[PDB]
């Protein structure tokens with residue numbers, strides 16, 4: 001038999017996740033790609049990102065702790 | 075190795091998030107240390123000043139996987155000190171125009187990386203100033219992961235213990251603090267080639283979302299939207315992979331109110347079921363509607379029976395299966411037998427339901443996952 005019975009609990013919310021529950025990252029390592037400007041400039045990539053709104057975008061990863069901000073650099 | 079980034083680099087990232095309707099969280103460098111191994115906030119002060127001048131709405135983290143700092147940079151920062159460092163950063167943000175921004179941390183690895191003492195001492199020290207506790211999870215090593223690992227309910231089930239161990243630390247130090255998976259995917263080391271980027275990746279991704287929601291995780295941050303690692307949602311040609319389509323369908327159908335479903339069969343763990351209120355920002359559905367999602371890791375079709383009193387309702391199926399010839403190793407996916415592709419570079423396709431005949435069992439093919447919206451469920455918890 002390949003038939004399965006489901007039990008449901010429906011009395012009350014057990015949890016309330018954020019509307020941004022399904023969020024995404026960009027690895028800090030991508031900022032070391034020479035093409036970084038071209039890539040995140042992509043209207044195509046923006047269409048795909050908009051599809052996942054609302055969401056957090058976390059920028060971070062191993063490289064987080066090996067990046068230094070230069071207000072002089074172009 | 076150390077590397078610098080420009081005002082331009084910040085502007086590109088900010089504009090990507092802004093124009094995409096996403097909320098940017100920026101990881102600050104936590105290895106900038108004084109002689110005393112206090113956090114040096116001067117570089118971060120430059121960055122906060124620049125983002126201020128621009129009117130940038132940004133939230134913050136400090137450090138990534140601090141447990142690894144000895145391994146990665148021959149610097150050991152105990153959790154008490156990192157907690158002290160989050161307190162300095164919080165005072166900075168309060169003394170800036172980012173006064174109302176959020177601060178998350180500490181982005182520790184999963185319990186298996188023996189991170190309990192670091193997270194506990196961190197929360198004792200700095201827990202008062204963080205808006206959520208962030209931790210990371212991967213099931214597998216990308217270099218050794220196999221196709222069977224991605225289909226193994228025993229692999230999926232380990233995540234449950236990881237989450238219980240994180241809650242045990244948090245309950246003991248900052249009970250009621252929100253817990254976030256700040257960085258998570260299938261396989262560390264950049265993902266598993268032809269596994270992390272295929273239809274096969276979706277079993278781990280949809281199960282992690284289901285268990286995360288069921289167990290009280292508020293936010294799950296997928297490694298990565300786009301980048302070099304095979305666990306990217308979008309590949310190097312800017313083409314959406316099966317996990318992108320899964321993620322979009324999840325967003326359209328699944329609401330914020332988490333409920334529970336379970337299989338009456340006493341075993342397998344092969345048929346995995348999750349239940350939320352339907353997303354009501356979705357215009358086809360109404361207050362009270364339920365969204366069931368299910369994974370079938372059996373090698374045959376299984377037929378799900380809805381319990382009383384939902385067993386005569388109209389149900390919309392949203393069944394995901396790979397487009398051939400590569401089966402579970404495919405990078406292309408079909409929704410109810412129609413291939414999911416962008417209509418063009420500006421336009422996503424409709425996500426077309428398949429209405430089922432009322433009172434039918436829910437058919438879930440072998441090695442497949444599906445959403446089912448129970449229409450007119452009239453669930454008062456979802457009203």
Ligand SMILES: *[C@@H]1O[C@H](CO)[C@@H](O)[C@H](O)[C@H]1NC(C)=O
Pocket residue numbers: 373374
């Ligand atoms: C399912 O797996 C079993 C192993 O228990 C195997 O012997 C059987 O032939 C498989 N069935 C199908 C439909 O592939």
Ligand SMILES: O=C(O)[C@H]1CNCC(O)(O)[C@@H]1O
Pocket residue numbers: 027060061062063139210257261262263264265297303
């Ligand atoms: O794939 C991995 O091993 C991850 C682990 N966490 C840090 C990271 O996100 O930078 C890395 O890419």
Ligand SMILES: [Cl-]
Pocket residue numbers: 027029030300301302303
């Ligand atoms: Cl990357």
